[PDB]
Amino acid sequence: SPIIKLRNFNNAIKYILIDKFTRAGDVVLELACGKGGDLRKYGAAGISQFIGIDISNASITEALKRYHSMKNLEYQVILITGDCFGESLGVAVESFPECRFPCDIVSCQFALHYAFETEEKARRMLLNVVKSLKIGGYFFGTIPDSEFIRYKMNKIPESVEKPSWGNSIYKVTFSNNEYQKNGNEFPSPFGQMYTFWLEDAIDNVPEYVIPFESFRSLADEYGMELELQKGFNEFFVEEIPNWVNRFSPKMREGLKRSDGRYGVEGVEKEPAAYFYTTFAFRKVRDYQ
Ligand SMILES: Nc1ncnc2c1ncn2[C@@H]1O[C@H](CSCC[C@H](N)C(=O)O)[C@@H](O)[C@H]1O
Ligand SMILES: [Ca+2]
Ligand SMILES: [Ca+2]
Ligand SMILES: [Ca+2]
Ligand SMILES: [Ca+2]
Ligand SMILES: [Ca+2]
């Protein structure tokens, strides 16, 4: 189905992205790790320790259940219920002294935009990231692409009170049209809410825009400089040749279009390949 193909595609994106920035021996902190479904991707990249934190205890309980069913892992796994964005990370990790901080990588998949609820939370998130990382370490992940959101929003006239677009498997509905009323510009980088539906994945959840220019500028204030901002489509096109013969021959089959080549097509193309972007930054200096 379209949604199965979207999930396979996103998993391939994550496999490639994790391998790109993770190397043998690394310690990874995964913010907003959810149910912890990427452990084997970090394992394949050779990590020595995984630390996952999520605000949802239900998700962490499930992440722990999944982890405990695994056998003979070469790396340590620490899973913590805690707020990664609105509170200092020291609160969450105080009772887990086995965590090896500073770490080599911080990752955050399909979640960092939650930190853009307010400026306070965006800055607390960035402080948590830089203080956790070694100088030279990387911060990477996957977020809704504000540049694609702005393209869609620029095609919606100001007369529409709740700007919306979508297709048979996904929908975006903005809470207000302040963007269009403000000359097609968000009045603030923070708290710009839209409801997001993705079939069998995201049940009409309020989400916040993460304007990339603001994210980049803020990151620079905390000593992090841009490494990557390719949209999912371009990232996949460029990386899949290194990657065809490495994937699970079933995941390989799951990445095949009708025309026989690798990617996504049909109703899944827009949410899978355009709506999301990769991101990465490198910590080049200490936040003083
Ligand atoms: N302040 C916060 N601190 C930590 N996790 C948070 C958070 N606000 C939201 N989250 C988490 O953000 C996640 C968004 S869904 C993405 C989860 C996971 N990374 C995946 O790719 O499947 C949820 O697991 C949610 O509980
Ligand atoms: Ca703050
Ligand atoms: Ca704007
Ligand atoms: Ca740069
Ligand atoms: Ca780039
Ligand atoms: Ca791109």
Author numbering: 138 to 425
Sentences from the paper on this structure:
A crystal of KlAbd1Δ137 that had been preincubated with 0.7 mM SAH diffracted X-rays to 1.3 Å resolution, was in space group P21 and contained two enzyme protomers in the asymmetric unit. Clear electron densities for SAH were observed in the methyl donor site of both Abd1 protomers. The two protomers in the asymmetric unit are nearly identical and are superimposable with an root mean square deviation (r.m.s.d) of 0.4 Å over 289 Cα positions. KlAbd1Δ137 contains structural motifs that are characteristic of the class 1 methyltransferases, which include a seven-stranded (β1–β5 and β10–β11) central β-sheet surrounded by helices αA–αD, helix αF, and one 310 helix. In the KlAbd1 crystal structure, SAH occupies the methyl donor site in a conformation similar to that observed previously for SAM, SAH, and aza-SAM in Ecm1 or RNMT and SAH interacts with an ensemble of conserved residues in a manner similar to Ecm1 and RNMT. The adenine base of SAH is sandwiched between the side chains of Ile192 and Phe222 and is partially shielded from the solvent by the side chain of Tyr251. Adenine-N1 and -N6 form hydrogen bonds with the Cys221 amide nitrogen and Asp220-Oδ1, respectively. The ribose O2′ and O3′ atoms form a bidentate hydrogen bond with Asp191-Oδ1 and Oδ2. The SAH amino nitrogen donates hydrogen bonds to the main-chain carbonyl oxygens of Ala169 and Gln246 and makes water-mediated contacts with Glu-Oε2, the Leu168 and Ala169 main-chain carbonyls, and the Gln246 main-chain amide.
The essential enzyme messenger RNA (mRNA) (guanine-N7) methyltransferase catalyzes S-adenosylmethionine (SAM)-dependent conversion of GpppRNA ends to the m7GpppRNA cap structure characteristic of eukaryal mRNAs. The antibiotic sinefungin (SFG) is a SAM analog in which the S-CH3 sulfonium moiety of SAM is replaced by a C-NH2 amine. Available evidence indicates that the antifungal activity of SFG is exerted via inhibition of fungal cap methyltransferase Abd1. Crystal structures of K. lactis and S. cerevisiae Abd1 as binary complexes with SAH or SFG and ternary complexes with GTP•SFG highlight how SFG makes two hydrogen bonds from its C-NH2 amine to the guanine-O6 and -N7 atoms of GTP that account for its higher affinity vis-à-vis SAH and SAM.
